[PDB]
Symmetry: C2
Subunit: 142 residues, 2 copies
Amino acid sequence: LSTATTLFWRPVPVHVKQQDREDVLEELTFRILTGVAKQNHNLRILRIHISSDSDLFFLHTLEVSEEDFQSLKNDQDILVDFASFPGKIISLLEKCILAQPGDSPRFQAVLTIRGGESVFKIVEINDWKRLPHITLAFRPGN
Amino acid sequence: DLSTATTLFWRPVPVHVKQQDREDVLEELTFRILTGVAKQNHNLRILRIHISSDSDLFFLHTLEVSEEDFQSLKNDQDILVDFASFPGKIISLLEKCILAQPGDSPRFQAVLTIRGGESVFKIVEINDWKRLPHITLAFRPG
């Protein structure tokens, strides 16, 4: 990625679930970056890295180009453009950081790893249920 | 039929209705929400939701859930309240669907997808950046 810009780089509380192992609350580092493709300076690219300061082998990545963003828009019913998308994810992440055990509403981050694929989702716990705000597919490694 | 049934809600609601591979049309459907007990067991509470139409008397879709089967729905839809509190939440959402106006933000929207033997009802919230599903319910022929 050329001339990449860091939009977000902070620890976030995440409920991490392995395929058949324990469901554990951990502090994962989120790094969100924007830049352009090395092969095309007109093609903008979003990257999100999920890592861990305690486990150096822990790494999950999402990458989406502007020209492939419509697929994500269709899948997740997103109504804003590519440029506005990272700010929304950031807003959700900030809410997860602020969340307390007794809160309502309460935002919660969840990462489910089933092998070769991990599913990241942020949910809101309102007065009567858990409301899914976003569901994103991440891949193992870089 | 339900013994000592009480009607909690009986109102027309704007619904985007999609027939099997056919047209997606906005129609006014009547929703009736009632609670009562099983004819065979006065201790078993039962919720029923009827979807009808004042213009088409042949139209009827039904959902029924007993208190002892409510846990399945709680798990499926991530519901955090008890059986008794559940209808009031659905009613509130339906009223928001009734009130929604062009230009409103947020704006609530009701959707019914009809297949051969089953229909899927959903209420979504359209905020600034996406469509947020608040509830998804399966209906059966009356």
